[PDB]
Every structure is written in C-alpha cells, then in structure tokens.
C-alpha cells in the first residue's frame, strides 16, 4: 500500500450503556474511556507509530482521546486539527431517549429504520428538546465553515458521510498524498461513514460492520486513496474480540 | 483598550530549584507544574474567559499547560497552534549544569553576564553536550520553518526576541487584529521577550520584570498592537504574591 492511516473511536460512556445516544451532547470520557485512549496510545507506541498530523471532531471526548494518545506517544507537538464534520451522528430528537422511549413517541415500525437503515433521517431536534440549547448555544458552533442555522438538526448515516466527505477530500486526503502519517480520533458513525467511502462498502453492508472502540484501525490506501484489502485492527487478539463483543447488537 | 491578549508561563521544575536551565530539554511538568496549570484554568474560568485561539511552543510542558487550562475552561475545541519560536531560551552549552558548575568551566564574571545580560549569547551547544542528540535527533525540529542545522545552538534574551518577532508579526498579530481572544502558553524568556517588545521595555529594565508562573498575564493593546499601559496579573490577589515572592527567591 502506498499509504497508511490510523483511525479509532473513543470508548462509549454511561449513556451508551443505558442504550441512549450521546450524539452531539458534549459529554466527557469516563474512567473506562480514558483508559482505552491510554492503552491505545501504548499500543501505537509499541508499534512505533510516528504521526505527523491529527484530526478530531469538536466533541471533547474525541479530542481528549487524541491528547492521551499523543502523551503516550510523546508526540504532544504533533499538530491537532478539529472539525464538526468529524462529529458523531446527529440523532435529532432521539438524543437522550432509550429504545423504549423512542418506540413510544414515534412508533416501533418508525424507529426501526432510524437506527438500522442507511438513509432514513430521524426527526429534527427542536427548541423544546432538553438538549437543544446546550448544543446550539455553544460558541464552538458559531465558528464552523457554515452558519449555526445551516448545521444538522438530525442525520442518517448517509447524511454523516455527506458532510464528512468534504472534509476528507479538502483537508485530510491532501495530507495523506503528501506522505504524512495521520491519526483520526472519531466517533461511531464518523468512523463508520469514512470506512464505507474508503473501502467502497454498499449501503446494505455498512450497517453490519464491526467497530470496536479503543482499538487502532489501520488502513492501507493505494494511489487513489482507496483501501487495499480489509482494514486491520492493531493489538492483541484478546483485547480486540472483547472490544468487538462490546459493540455488538 | 480595543484589543486583549492573555499570556502565561508553566510551573518550573526540579532543575529550576537546583538553579539549572531546562531550556530546550523537553522535560514534562511535575506534580507542582500541573496543579498550577489547572488552578490557572480555574482562575480563567472564574473570570469567564473565552479564547478563540491558542499558541504554544514545541516543548511539551508548554502544551500540557494549555491542555489543562482548556479542559478547565471546557474549551478543548479551541484551535491550538505550536511553534519553536515560542520555545524557552536556548542556553547553549549551559543546558544542564548548575551555578557551581557553570563557574567552574567559564568564570563567575563571564557567567554573571550570560544570565543577567540582555544581549550576551552563551556559548553554543556542541555535538558533545550530554543533551545535544536528545534535542537535535528529535523529529519535531525536522518540520520547522527553518532546517534543523539552522536552529539556534544557544541564545541571548535578545536572540530569543528576534526569532519570536517573526511569529508574532506573521501569525499571532493578524489574529488579534481580527478580533480574536488569544492565549499564549509560553516559557520564562519567551514571555519575557514578548512583553518587552509590546510594552517597549528597555534592555536594562527588562532584566528585572517579575514573571510569575501559573498566572494569567493580561495585555491591553491599541490599534498598533502596542501596550496601553503595563501588563496586569489576574486572579486572587492573595495567590498572586505567592507567585511573585516565589519567583523572587
């Protein structure tokens, strides 16, 4: 492979356990999630990875994961760049609720698509939503490449890929093609959407892809930046199968 | 005034109490050095500071200081930018040695200059210094705005100001004039050189300015980015003397 890039997702937290979607709520990593980031950094140091640039989202759990890895690598000097286009999927009005609360207010049949389909967008988050203010009042969203009102109020995995692509093509890809070793600290859907694009996965298969957290996901790309072969999880097989088992269902 | 800018320095280490100059050696902050960064962040949060951009050096103690402040401010998303031109003063061959040792190899009168003068450059570091490789083998310096061999091998307070100016003028100044609230996590001489320039301090008076660590240094600039008065230390007026008196001993 002419190029190699590493990617991973932070460890999910308390909400994920209760089957709730943190989404764009800027929750901090818990003890377990901070341990994953460290162990991941140790794993990369053990593989002598030397990064030249780092890309993260605007959500602090993404960033803190990157910081802990850089500290473990002793590469805190590596430029770090953040963007909302790398943010987790915006679940709209479904933010906060568990599976049962969703079926109750929207319809079981209706809820199925929203979590298991590739292009069905959940209903938009509204002024009346408990977390509406906390997201849009945040001044980090007042300095994006698009005005606050032009940002997502809900998203499908397809939507995510569509606002992520611009960032890959305009900011990240040029750096890979320039010989740089990149690290991408992302989220569940963020990383999922980028893998679909680089690996050419169908709309039907993208849904079933396994994405363990706290695990380095190595991608070997050719001259067109298209993945050569399957992405590989780096680290000991035990730690991997436990992580995989954790993102099941 | 019309513009504002916050500067500060990291807590000194063990070497500094042994009266040794860490200089460009990339030492990590100690327990003491990290608590200062946090308390400083808490002090800024307490003052409702909202930064739009952050500048640090390439030495990790500078960076970690910034990260701890951003975390305390809940502004981990603020872009961070690092440069060697913000690095601590390069003390040349004097890196490592203590007072007793410097004299033993150079002379009480000759060393008194290199430490208390504004323009006398210490001898350069030789390829035989214990810390030479540790500094020039590092890849963080193989990606600077000037080739590795062209980096200072020692410096005077004047030298520091001369390689810092290009970065103020070209990178930071434009952002201040653009309405942005900047934060600069620097070092002893770095912060000293910058204040001298912006406040128009003499070569003799500069030597005596008291630069407490872990303290927010507010600077109000006019339209020409010149100091509109003297810089001011912010925070609990109680803890501020604990900072100055400690720096004065």
Swiss-Prot record, chains A, B:
Free-text activity regulation comment from the record: At alkaline pH BPGM favors the synthase reaction; however, at lower pH the phosphatase reaction is dominant. Inhibited by citrate.
EC identifiers of the protein: 5.4.2.4, 5.4.2.11
Glycosylation: residue positions: 2, 4, 17, 42, 158, 196
Tissue and organ expression note: Expressed in red blood cells. Expressed in non-erythroid cells of the placenta; present in the syncytiotrophoblast layer of the placental villi at the feto-maternal interface (at protein level).
Membrane-crossing residue ranges in chain numbering: none
Residues engaged in binding substrate: 9-16, 22-23, 61, 88-91, 99, 115-116, 188-189
PROSITE patterns per UniProt: PG_MUTASE (PS00175)
InterPro entries in the cross-refs: His_Pase_superF_clade-1, His_PPase_superfam, PG/BPGM_mutase_AS, Phosphogly_mut1
Active site: 10 (tele-phosphohistidine intermediate), 88 (proton donor/acceptor)
Site (Transition state stabilizer): 187
MF terms (GO), sorted A to Z: bisphosphoglycerate mutase activity; hydrolase activity; phosphoglycerate mutase activity
Residues under site feature: Not glycated: 28, 45, 142, 180, 245-246
GO terms under biological process: carbohydrate derivative catabolic process; carbohydrate metabolic process; cellular response to stress; defense response to protozoan; erythrocyte development; establishment of blood-brain barrier; glycolytic process; neuroinflammatory response
Classification via Pfam families: His_Phos_1
Keywords on record: Acetylation, Congenital erythrocytosis, Disease variant, Glycation, Glycolysis, Glycoprotein, Hereditary hemolytic anemia, Hydrolase, Isomerase, Phosphoprotein
Disease: Erythrocytosis, familial, 8: An autosomal recessive disorder characterized by elevated serum hemoglobin and hematocrit, and biphosphoglycerate mutase deficiency. ECYT8 affected individuals manifest hemolytic anemia and splenomegaly.
Reported function: Plays a major role in regulating hemoglobin oxygen affinity by controlling the levels of its allosteric effector 2,3-bisphosphoglycerate (2,3-BPG). Also exhibits mutase (EC 5.4.2.11) activity.
Classification via NCBIfam families: pgm_1, PRK14115.1
Name the UniProt record assigns to this protein: Bisphosphoglycerate mutase
Organism placement in taxonomy: Eukaryota, Metazoa, Chordata, Craniata, Vertebrata
């Amino acid at each position: 492979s002419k190029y190699k890039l590493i990617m991973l997702r932070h460890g999910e937290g308390a909400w994920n356990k209760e089957n709730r979607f943190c989404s764009w709520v800027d929750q901090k990593l818990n003890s377990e999630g901070m341990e994953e980031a460290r162990n991941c950094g140790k794993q990369l140091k053990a593989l002598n990875f030397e990064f030249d640039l780092v890309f993260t989202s605007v959500l602090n759990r993404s960033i803190h994961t990157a910081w802990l890895i850089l500290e473990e690598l002793g590469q805190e000097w590596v430029p770090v760049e953040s963007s909302w286009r790398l943010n987790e999927r915006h679940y709209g009005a479904l933010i906060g609720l568990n599976r049962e609360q969703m079926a109750l207010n929207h319809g079981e049949e209706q809820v199925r698509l929203w979590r298991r389909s590739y292009n069905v967008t959940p209903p938009p988050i509204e002024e009346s939503h408990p977390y509406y203010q906390e997201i849009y009042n945040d001044r980090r969203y007042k300095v994006c490449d698009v005005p606050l009102d032009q940002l997502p109020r809900s998203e499908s995995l397809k939507d995510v890929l569509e606002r992520l692509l611009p960032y890959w093509n305009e900011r990240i890809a040029p750096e890979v093609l320039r010989g740089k070793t990149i690290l991408i600290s992302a989220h569940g859907n963020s990383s999922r959407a980028l893998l679909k694009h680089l690996e050419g996965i169908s709309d039907e298969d993208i849904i079933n892809i396994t994405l363990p957290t706290g695990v380095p996901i190595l991608l070997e790309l050719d001259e067109n930046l298209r993945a050569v072969g399957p992405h590989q999880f780096l680290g000991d097989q035990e730690a991997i199968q436990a992580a995989i088992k954790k993102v099941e269902d």
